[PDB]
Design a protein around this nucleic acid. Sequence first.
DNA 1: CTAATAGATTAGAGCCGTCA
RNA 2: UGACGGCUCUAAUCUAUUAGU
DNA 3: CTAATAGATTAGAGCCGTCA
RNA 4: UGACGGCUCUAAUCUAUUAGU
Lengths: 419, 419, 469, 469
Amino acid sequence: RNKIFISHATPDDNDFTRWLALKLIGLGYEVWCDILFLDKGVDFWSNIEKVIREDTCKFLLVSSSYSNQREGVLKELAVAAKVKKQLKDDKFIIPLAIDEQLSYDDINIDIVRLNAIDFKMSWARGLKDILEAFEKQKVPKEVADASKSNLLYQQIFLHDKSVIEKEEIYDSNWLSILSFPEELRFHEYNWMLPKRFDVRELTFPAVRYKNYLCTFAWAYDFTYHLPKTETYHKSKTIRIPTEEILSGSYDSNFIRNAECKRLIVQLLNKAFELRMKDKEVQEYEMSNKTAYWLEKGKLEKDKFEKTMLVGKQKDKNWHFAISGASKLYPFPVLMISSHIFFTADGKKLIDSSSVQHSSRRRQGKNWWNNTWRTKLLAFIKYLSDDDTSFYLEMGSEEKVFVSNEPVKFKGNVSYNIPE
Amino acid sequence: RNKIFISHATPDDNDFTRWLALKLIGLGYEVWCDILFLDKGVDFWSNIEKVIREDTCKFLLVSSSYSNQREGVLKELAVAAKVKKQLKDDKFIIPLAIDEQLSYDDINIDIVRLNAIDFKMSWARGLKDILEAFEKQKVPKEVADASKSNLLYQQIFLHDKSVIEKEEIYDSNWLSILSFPEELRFHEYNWMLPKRFDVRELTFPAVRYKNYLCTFAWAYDFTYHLPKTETYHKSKTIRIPTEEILSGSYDSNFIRNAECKRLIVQLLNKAFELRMKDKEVQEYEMSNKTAYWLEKGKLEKDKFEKTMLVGKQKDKNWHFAISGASKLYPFPVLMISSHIFFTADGKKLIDSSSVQHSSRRRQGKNWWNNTWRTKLLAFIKYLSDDDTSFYLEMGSEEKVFVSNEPVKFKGNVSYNIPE
Amino acid sequence: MKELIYIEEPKILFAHGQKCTDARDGLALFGPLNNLYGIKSGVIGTKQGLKIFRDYLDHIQKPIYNSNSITRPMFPGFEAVFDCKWESTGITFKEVTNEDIGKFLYNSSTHKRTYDLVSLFIDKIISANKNEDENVDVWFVIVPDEIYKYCRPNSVLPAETYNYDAQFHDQFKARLLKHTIPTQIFRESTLAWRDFKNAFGLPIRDFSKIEGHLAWTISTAAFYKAGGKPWKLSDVRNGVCYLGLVYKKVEKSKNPRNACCAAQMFLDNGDGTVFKGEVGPWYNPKNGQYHLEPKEAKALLSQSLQSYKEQIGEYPKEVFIHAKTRFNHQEWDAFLEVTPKETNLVGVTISKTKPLKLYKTEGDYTILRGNAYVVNERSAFLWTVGYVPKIQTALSMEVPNPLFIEINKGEADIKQVLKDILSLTKLNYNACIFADGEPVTLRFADKIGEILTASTDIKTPPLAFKYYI
Amino acid sequence: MKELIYIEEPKILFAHGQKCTDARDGLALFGPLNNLYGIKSGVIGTKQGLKIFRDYLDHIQKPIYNSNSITRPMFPGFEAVFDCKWESTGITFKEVTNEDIGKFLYNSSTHKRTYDLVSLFIDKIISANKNEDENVDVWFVIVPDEIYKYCRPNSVLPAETYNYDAQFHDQFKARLLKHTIPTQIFRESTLAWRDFKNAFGLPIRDFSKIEGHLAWTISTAAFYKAGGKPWKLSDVRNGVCYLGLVYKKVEKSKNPRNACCAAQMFLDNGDGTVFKGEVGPWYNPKNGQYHLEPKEAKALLSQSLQSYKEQIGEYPKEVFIHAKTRFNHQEWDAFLEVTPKETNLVGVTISKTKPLKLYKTEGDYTILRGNAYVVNERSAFLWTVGYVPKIQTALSMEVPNPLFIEINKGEADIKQVLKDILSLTKLNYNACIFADGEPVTLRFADKIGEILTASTDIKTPPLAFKYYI
DNA sequence: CTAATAGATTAGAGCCGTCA
RNA sequence: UGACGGCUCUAAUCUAUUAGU
DNA sequence: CTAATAGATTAGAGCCGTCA
RNA sequence: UGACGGCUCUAAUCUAUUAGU
Ligand SMILES: [Mg+2]
Ligand SMILES: [Mg+2]
């Protein structure tokens, strides 16, 4: 009949039964268990008895604590005993002891004069003994091919384990820049500005270049710090439109494309720093970058838009801070970083690297994807200007409008999230 | 009942049966085999049948080409079948297939579907299978100890192999020098002796020392080669006796005892060479030492008391040869060696070292201990003059008697030499 | 709105020709490729360390269980998995007394004391390798915690001595290259984590729920270091050879300079995977200059091409040069002059600086593991670390950080480059993990470099990996 | 004329603490003392060599029959005796192109072609060991028979590298001492001799009834080289250390330079035997003087005694310095200078070139093996080759030569000294024979000396015997 | 050559978490 | 060099005495 | 320091048999 | 160093402009 029945303690031993079934199937011996025939539409009980009585050659049983004194196990044993009596098969039930806690004093009275195969130390000896028993007893075999094992692994192991295509929207920390001022302006100051003026500290962004000055503001702007500026013809300046710079079009011996793009990035970073300093937000200085964080009591109930930005951890109060980085690859963006900073009482930080690192690494265990996402989006919304724009000051009228909704990606591959 | 019987092909399969029996006994399992005992003449099949029927728990039969279609194998199979029928035991006979070339077309009809243990792959695998089957069959056993196997090996394998005290008599090649002269003489010939006369050509032995002459001979002797000897005074000879300078009772500043002993050795060797030259015997020039051999037909029918000294090998002739030496450790001996030489027709040598070496190698294969002893002693007795001895002239009338019987040695331990 | 693509998870070929995605399941269902007959294990250390090692080696024979079986596949036993014998009866011992170790850690100078301790430990190994008769496959060094905590590059108190790195591990691995001795270093804290305690009644390292994974890693290290091949790639493109580059800064070897090391992979004749380095540091004296002068670049490419030709007999059709730096025109003109006409050279640079963190709306689990945002024809992203549906967990905490793939020099399909980079993440033999977050051709090069840099000049170094890792 | 005596037979301790007299029967009955799990091998040679090696390995699977069991016991199979595996599936092949061998036979100089062939083999062996991830135990070489045919020094046509010998085997083993790779050299004719015949219709070499002994010898050698201990002495007391000094002629230099190489053996306190070589070559610029200078004598003795102390803890009470020559007062005084107080120093001299052959008067069979002729309180004659009642055959076909054992300097009983010599002939691991004609402390010293004399670029050579035999 | 302003790159070290 | 055994042809060296010092 | 006359020690190489 | 992942404090090199030499 070529079919072999294996019984165990379903479902407390899925791994061992599955491994034994696959190892036996790959060696040419079929195994009947719940892993096969994954369907419940047909009767799930009468099929077992019909298979045992009609087309089963060798019957097997696995001894376990759960299988003992089980109604189903007892019924299967009774049916097997009846089949053995009908066939006059001396060796029709072969129990296998796999539990270490099953003492010899509490063994079943039915099986007391039959030797038992141990499985406590190593399963290889038991498998070899089973193979020797099958080959000696002329146990029938199927076609010898690994295709059976491969197909069973492909269609049974990953039955409820395959990815399902479904639309999902991914949020980022990339605030897309919407608008730029029309023209870039290098202003020619023929030694009118002091040789050691330190132009980086005036009211508007400014980067020195040759004998001129680079800025987005008006020709006669930020003249409070430079009294000797009015006596200057406006025609002595170079206006490079910013649309052709961010198009790979402008390249002149005066200044190249790469240097002008770097200048624009630097100016955007300075403008972002000034704007974040003008929003009344305290800052923490890191090794290379600067993060801006809220104080306790400035925000209503330490919670904006049903989400919390300042909380409490035992003797330490934590605050949520971000840093800005401007890039032009692949398109004008503004990368925003997620940071956590801690305070003793909500206004004074703790000045020690070890304690800050310890507190930061202790918090992340509780927080997850949703916490980070909602807190960052709430922070950006708090920084918002009117509804969806968050400009940066560059001059009298010139402004760079940065969106408060980060770039969103869509993906056709996602998981079911089985809670 | 705690016994296993092995039926094999005596004496064709003694090795495999013995190895299996010793391996099984080493683990503490009793094994009963026909070759284990040596009780023959008394009722043998009746005891075998009684042991098989009464106190035999397992029976194994080995099968080979010799064991196939054999009366003993068939009778043992019939007895085993009768025992199995009486006991109604299915597992009582287990073949041990050891003949790889014995195809199933010619195997015994009594054993054609029986489960035969495979020994073709590796015999240790077969032994492990036998042990596993015996454990499954619950063969009675005691604690693991090879003491029984060690006792069986001691009392069976080395039964007639112990130390036996038997007197033995040995021959050798040391021929003891018997007769010695009265004194040694230096014949001072101060600017009165020949200088380049090649004193190793005289009719009497001589060894020089400074301007003297060290020999046992008298001054008046060998005057033929030395005309200026008569005009000389006997007071100018340093006489030294022999017994004490053999025993080392000589301590004089004139000559050292070791040097005088060396001169003694040289005198003995020169006397041997001259005397063997007097016998009119042929001479062979080897690397360092010179051997002695007879021509073809020197004696009557090339024999001396049924000992052959000149013969013919294929299309070539051979002559037995010996060599001697005069050493004084531990006691005065004339050690004798043996060699072989070849002649093309019977009187002329072959001038080729490789041919001589190969010819000696080929001939000596068929000569045994008795052959060498007989030839050596017979060639020695050719020298011995009258009844028991032979002389080496070392003076005017002084003869040195060398014996013709080899030095004997006595031993107290020997073997039973079971043909 | 922008578009993301998905690249599927590659499989790896285990025994019997079967293909399984996870290394753990592949080994626990099919087994390793080759067959070792056993592991002749030797131990070097103190008596207590030997006792704890013996207890641990007796401990992992039985099936040992994790906490959450769905997330982490189980370790059922060494013989049932790796198909070879490994017990504590064949252990060979060589004692190092406590007095010697205690007296060597008394010089108050990290360099001299480390030198002395390494020499103490290695002379015994060399002598037992030359003089004795016993055959040892892997030497298991058991270093006590009391000297481990001080063998660090930076030590503060609460003459060819400056040419060697102040680390016990790297000095140990670089002082045994001329004798070719496989070696595994263990700690007294890892083995007896229960016995070692703190001020409170708790173990320092809680392994009560990471027991199976620890056993898996230790067992696969012991199997590979003895001459085994636990798994291999399922599919490798033929005629295409890879490479990898890492730069390591020396510890003041008479001047601050930097070296370059390599480790390649390809499918040779016989359907086998060769995974073997290209040893020999190539320096340049300029400080902070992570490039190759033309002579060194020509020598490197010529050596790789000659090795491939000697193994096969046909020149490669494609040569991929993975790196973390960028290639200037000087060293690419150094290449393509020894490159054959019928050969294509591609330069791929991999870095993880750019911070694009992608979140899931109304969810608690992070992004998946096979994504890619192809920016242009010569740029992309790849989320090698992320959620895995098979094991229902994320490879990283918080939100994982993506990779960057740019074809600085050469022409090829970017999708194929991403797929090839993604496949080189499944070949970490130092641990039995599902997938790696960095291609191993740029990590085993670093492993070689950190060891070669920790010694003096040595000629003709070995190319196998078991002598370094 | 003086009465003889009998010096019994030695015992050797196999597995399970059992005893026997013949190694074959004890190994085939009880088993070896060590449990090697397996053996991995690699063959170098033309494809013919690979075919012949594979056929020979598969040949041991078939039964091997000896003509007479008592005279020459059979081979009961590899795995059935040695409890290990050596199969024709772990073979690793490095083909040697026949063109390379053929093209090297043009210099017409024996030294150059010998060096070139040794290089052509050892280069592949070294590179395979260095740059391949498989673990090997013994490397086998299958030399073409034409190479050995053309290596005859007496052949006519019908200085940095000049200090090398003109032999393939010695130089080949010599240039692998700094890599510690055990090697076995096979001549292709020995493995496949049936196909090698002459113009007579019969094979050149006949192994028909002596194939079993050849299988015994090869199996025992390949087991010993891989780290096994098939048998061991049991009648060895405590405190006794044996040394055997053998002198050579290095030549290949400005002076004859008679070098000295030794061996050492004693007990290890763990009920084991330490049979290892003791070779750091000590050179004497004098020609023909076979005695060591006082500095060399002190160095040799001090090194041996320091090794004894390191292995045990305290110095021996009795050292037997065997040699094939006599000694002089200055050398013995130099030994006495470094020797402690309660350390008896005994010199023994053993010779065979003494004409004394005993002819049996009654029968034609040879003399009993263990007989002796005690000449004097300080000399006696020992027979070691002849008739043994266990094997019922003669060790030597002709009338054998005895051994002239004498004691030269020091005092020791002349039957215990002769019993130890007969007890030291049962530990020849190179060949599987009942007995040899010399103690192994004076036999393996010769092989040690002849291996490390072809090349002089070796400092601190290995001491294990698996790299020398 | 020396000393500052920045953007864009690289390699080292050291500390913490892994489950529920 | 798969071993072992038995042979054969060669070369130094030392010791002693003698003649070229 | 060289060359012969001996005895007494030493180390190299080469060749052949193993069964019946 | 049984793995891996995520952070933080630091150091170079390059490119552009300016300036004392
Ligand atoms: Mg490791
Ligand atoms: Mg050998």
